[PDB]
Amino acid sequence: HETDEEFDARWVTYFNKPDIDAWELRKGMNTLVGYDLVPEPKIIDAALRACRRLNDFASAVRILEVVKDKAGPHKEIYPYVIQELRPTLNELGISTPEELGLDKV
Amino acid sequence: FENRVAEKQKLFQEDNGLPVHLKGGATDNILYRVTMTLCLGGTLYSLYCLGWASFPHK
Amino acid sequence: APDFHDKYGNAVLASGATFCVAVWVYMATQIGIEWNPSPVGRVTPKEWR
Amino acid sequence: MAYPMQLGFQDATSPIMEELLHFHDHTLMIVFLISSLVLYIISLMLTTKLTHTSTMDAQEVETIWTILPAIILILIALPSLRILYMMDEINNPSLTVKTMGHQWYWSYEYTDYEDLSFDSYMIPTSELKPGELRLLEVDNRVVLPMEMTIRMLVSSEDVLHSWAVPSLGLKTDAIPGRLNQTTLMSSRPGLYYGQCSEICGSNHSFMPIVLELVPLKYFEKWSASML
Amino acid sequence: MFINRWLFSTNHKDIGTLYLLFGAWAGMVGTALSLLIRAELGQPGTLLGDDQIYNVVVTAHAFVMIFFMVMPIMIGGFGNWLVPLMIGAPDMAFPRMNNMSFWLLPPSFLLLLASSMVEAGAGTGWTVYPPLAGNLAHAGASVDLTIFSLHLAGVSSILGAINFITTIINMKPPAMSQYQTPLFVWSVMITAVLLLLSLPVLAAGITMLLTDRNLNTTFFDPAGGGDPILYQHLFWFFGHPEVYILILPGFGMISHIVTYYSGKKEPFGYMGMVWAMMSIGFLGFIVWAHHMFTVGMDVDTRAYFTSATMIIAIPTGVKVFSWLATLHGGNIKWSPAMMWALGFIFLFTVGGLTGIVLANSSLDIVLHDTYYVVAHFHYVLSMGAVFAIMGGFVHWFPLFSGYTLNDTWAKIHFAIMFVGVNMTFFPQHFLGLSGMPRRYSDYPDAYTMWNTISSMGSFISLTAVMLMVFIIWEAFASKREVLTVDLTTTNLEWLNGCPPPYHTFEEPTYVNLK
Amino acid sequence: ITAKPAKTPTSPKEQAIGLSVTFLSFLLPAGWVLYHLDNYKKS
Amino acid sequence: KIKNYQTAPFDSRFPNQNQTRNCWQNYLDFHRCEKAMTAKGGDVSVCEWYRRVYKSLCPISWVSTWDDRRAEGTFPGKI
Amino acid sequence: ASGGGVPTDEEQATGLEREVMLAARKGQDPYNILAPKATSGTKEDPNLVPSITNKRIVGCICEEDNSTVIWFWLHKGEAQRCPSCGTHYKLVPHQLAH
Amino acid sequence: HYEEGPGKNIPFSVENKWRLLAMMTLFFGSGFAAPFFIVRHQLLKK
Amino acid sequence: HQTHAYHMVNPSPWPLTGALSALLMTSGLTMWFHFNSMTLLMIGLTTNMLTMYQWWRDVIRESTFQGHHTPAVQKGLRYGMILFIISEVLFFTGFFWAFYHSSLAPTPELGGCWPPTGIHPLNPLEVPLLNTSVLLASGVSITWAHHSLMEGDRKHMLQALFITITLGVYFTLLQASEYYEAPFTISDGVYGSTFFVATGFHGLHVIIGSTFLIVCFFRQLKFHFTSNHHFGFEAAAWYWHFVDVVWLFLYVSIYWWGS
């Protein structure tokens, strides 16, 4: 169908809609995690900033958890994504699940 | 004959709580009792006949 | 809070396995079941006629 | 006959039964491969935390899993049907023998020349001679010439039975009113055993078949002595 | 009120519950008969008596398991509970006739018990072939009682088929086409078409047997120009469709279970699944004489029946691979129902493959009327139809009852049964290849090791059946009420809660056409 | 699925009673018949 | 004349597993021939091929029953 | 010789049959015999779902020829969206018979 | 109307788990026992 | 209150009395065949008739008198009747298969011929041809009755339906006389077996179909049918055409080709 970059750009556009509502935030994340991919940092960045516009800190943490979950046994993917998102995490004051202790079973 | 279906419609739509098989009146109950008595009595008799037929008779 | 499996799982696994092996070995060897294995390498043929 | 702990077919006594052995090896390889592949793919589908739950297009893969099974079926059917038509080929027998099933024994008629017939009953367990086989020996064996094409004709004088000798690859139903034909050819002398193969009442388990294959000259003297 | 509700029902859920209870009781009868078979065979010699008592037990075992356990549970039980809910219908089309399909089954079962109590029983095989089943070799009432038992079970199922086909064609939401109905509903529709067409031919054949036995007809008697083999054609024209009737609702339940516990909204390849069930239903009417390869048919007929039978592997393979593709990528929930469905995919595949071996008429000469056939059909029945029944029972018990099972106990139950059925039936392949016949109360000594193991497996399966009764007791004893069920957006039967109210869909669903 | 805690919890002792009664319901009548087979067969 | 008979040969009229009609036809042929020969004054020796074939193929009880029914006047085939 | 004497449905139909007949004459479908035609399904133009109570089950065939139907309860109040395609639905409760 | 809800949509009571155990014992145990008693019956004839 | 068009049926005893009637008829036939007694069979036949009467009575109450047969319910009953007829076609197919099996390969016991030695078939050009003209004529008169009903013509519906029933009765009386006059019997080997079981089940269906037509006649006398709503008449007419077509196959196969 479409290139990787075209797919990524549609998803960035989706989450960047300024007046995205809570339902659309959830619909987007719950649809995105059905695909055979871990979303690119630029997609996650847009989704986290949507959480910020929706005043929803908890869903921002949950989205970081679902990035780690989608990587499965590929343990190198989540730390990479967190690395790429650190400027956004610092800017928005988003703590990672690990910083909150929410990676403990 | 005259068309008396409207009379039967009134009878069978009367708001009396009766199920359809009893809604014609007292004759329905009698015929039900006859049917159910013959069925249940006949079924007991069939079980007696099985008891009889399950053993040899010399 | 530990659940039933945390508390008793090790004991159920060890006891069930030990019991199962013991009682099937006893059944298979001690009560006179005739398994009729192959005579090959086991039976010394004997004159019959 | 079968031997203890046996896993597969009795060794072949006839060329058609050898053909069936090789055909079964071919088909069992396929059965093992497909069963193992399904078990393996189950294990593969069940052993990853990776997910993909959106709609999956089916059209492409359904070509694979209709075409490959169709090819496999053809690779089974081709040797299967070759053997089927071999078994049916014209062969010109030297001898015709009839067997009639009864409750619960077999009778045999050899009426090409003389009026020869007899009954064949299981040896009771209490009367077995030392080394004889429980439920398989008979009083009067079906003596036949080895290395010769024999027409067997099978029928019944009461209920259904079925006349079977596994090591020759034979099983022909015994149907009253019907005369079913099969061909028998042993490559070897010896004693070849079978058992009634259609439920026929109280002693279905207890009406076996024992063929005794010997050289023609011994068969001819046996036949004459049985008149 | 109790009589009105449970003897005079016109409600699809209560009638479904009646069928599940009847089928569960029949399954205990059928399990007891299977233990008697394996007790007789578990050591060499004679335990109970000669082959007459033994084959009365074998014949009843098959009739009970097929007509009183599998078909009532799958079609009467799961079909009545689930089909109306899955299409948003308020009941079956003929809700009162539906009740008579249920109430014909206790009389049918009574006739079968009676057949075994009078005279010396019907020791015929579940195929009831003459002349053994005729009035000289089976004089007296037993075989006539068996025929009448089959007549009543056949009327029950023909009326039930009429009801299901009518309900599924006529009572969907107006916007829902047949290609928007769930696969279990398709599997029940197809099964009902097979029942409608096949059971009347069985009824004709067994009526001809009844008149040869009692009215001096000679349909099957050569003395009057009849033919025992005609009865075999009429019986097997029904009997091959009958095995697809036994498995197709199971295929439907397996598609739902695998979809659900894979966390998917839909099965892989829906139209291929519909195609494959229809193809299997159609091909299942043109193959019956593979039950007759040793009767003396012409070679070209044997070749046809070999080839037509093998082609059924193609649509069946599409279903197996589609279940594997439904697992693919799933968020797998290792529930007890999923374990039953995964066992089904593998063990049904094994049994189907030994069926393909048997389809080769040349090889079937040596395998027919041996335990290789018994191994084939118990892989597809005890490890196929029964595994789909147990997966569907564990999955939908909370819907029907409103209570949950203990999942750890249900996994223990699956583990015990899995060992037991495989230990019972796998060695029966060796017994068949090495020539052990069917319907024997005793065997030549060489066959002892595998008969001993097979009987030990049957006792393990007994332990699992006893445990299943305790598990159902524990659930009703503890009363853990259901709260939330996931995936209701693609499993409509759960959306009215657990249990659903007596009347559901009094206001129909809204579905538009766009 | 989620569910409420049991309205009438069945303790391990209660489960052992239910399990034992269930098993004995199946095993005692069949065992009685099979134990007495010889008594039946010759009669 | 074409003796050294061993058994009944393959007959293309009856090539399948069910040989009932082979037995029947040869029994009829023998007895039809025999009736023809005895009538016009002739030798049943000319019927011998059919005799040998039906004796090879036919169960003894079938032949016996058919013989009994020909003697009784109840044999349903045409001779 | 065509005579009369056979009642018509207009004359003699009764009960629910008569209710359905009279509603059809008016172009009304209180007993849900026809499939409703979708709107554009936006939030400004939601699909309007009649009900005699305050919730009704919707099935959404999100795209033409989908075999999967998406089922959910629609409640009285603000429009809700199909969880698969997002198309909007709004309950319109009313009085007696649809 | 009729009773609705868990434990009420069945023809047997689950109000007391021990009465239920007895009823389930009798129900499933009678089906399992019947073939053994029919075999006994067939042996005691002849 | 419901807002669909389907019929929720009142709880009914007739499924149970019908099922018990089936137990009594079958155990009754067993008692008659083996224990020289007709008592159970007579009870079963009586309870079966009572069950059928009250069940179908209640269907008339539900539809003519209570209005529950909306078009959706009527469409379901059309499918139900079509599927029932298909099941009956397959029942007869088993008896046609038996007939062609036995007649196409006549065994030595028959003489190796069909008809068997000793069998003297009826002449298909005599009463069997008359029976064929009678059932074909009744298919024409039931079609006249149907169009009369649709056109609102009470008198001619009743006339045509009476003629149809009369012809069904004529067929049944003719067949009963032919049974008595036939020189062969059900015990005359497979010729008698196939002839009397297949024509006998057909005669049973003629009696059933004639009874169904008589029910429709009296319902029509009582004005139950409207010119557009009369599914019980449609079902009886479909069943009657099925009985006619089965007879045409019996006539061509057993009476004509098999003679």
Added chain:
Amino acid sequence: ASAAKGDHGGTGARTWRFLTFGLALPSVALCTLNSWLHSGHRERPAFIPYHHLRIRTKPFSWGDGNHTFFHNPRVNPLPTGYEK
């Protein structure tokens, strides 16, 4: 085929009554004539106790067990021949 008739325009009650009285009932009357013309007993053939006829494997459950249900003494012999 178009048979040889040819009405239509509208298949209706008047046409089906025309067919009933103009073709169907005349055909029944013709066949009734043809039948009640060839009736009158035809002689019964010699009795021959063929074994594929007069089957008795179980007594019939009525009468003396040896008479068929619609036994006609004139034309139905028993296994031992015609009644007297």
Added chain:
Amino acid sequence: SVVKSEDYALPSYVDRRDYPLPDVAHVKNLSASQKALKEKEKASWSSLSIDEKVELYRLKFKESFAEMNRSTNEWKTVVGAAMFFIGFTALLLIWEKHYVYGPIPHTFEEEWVAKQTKRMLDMKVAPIQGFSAKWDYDKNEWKK
């Protein structure tokens, strides 16, 4: 918090790794301090404490991914109990052998089997592969 039977047709909460953002919050009713926390969440999240951030997470969600995905010791109970019940089965088989089965036939006696084995070798049972093929007729012993 408390989910009720009569809530069955309402949007519900679920912890599923494939449905990360459920249809409702885990906790819908808020105390005074929880209300003030949701107000503080409208300002910079850098000003929330770790504990405030955990509290916001636990208002929205019940279990974290690590919690909902945890493994358990249930397999030990399942396998162990299954082996117990399979073990119990052998008790049934021991009972059957003791009380139900009589002696087996005399053809399984050692001497009978030795004579029957010689006779099978004398008639060359399965001489190509199955049985007599394993006997060395030249050395009069089983092939090694």
Added chain:
Amino acid sequence: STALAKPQMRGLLARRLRFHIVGAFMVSLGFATFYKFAVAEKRKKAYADFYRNYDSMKDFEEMRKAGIFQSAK
């Protein structure tokens, strides 16, 4: 410290599937080769070797001398 490289993030399930379906195919071919050598050809060679110099009269004479026959002493 240094940054982490960008790993593959897309199609991880499909890549796993492809690799193991190929691996299953290679294993299937290996098994078919093994089975042909260990079962099918073994059986062909066992029957061919048995019959290559087989003397049926000698076999008969051994069986006769062992006393197995009814028809031959």
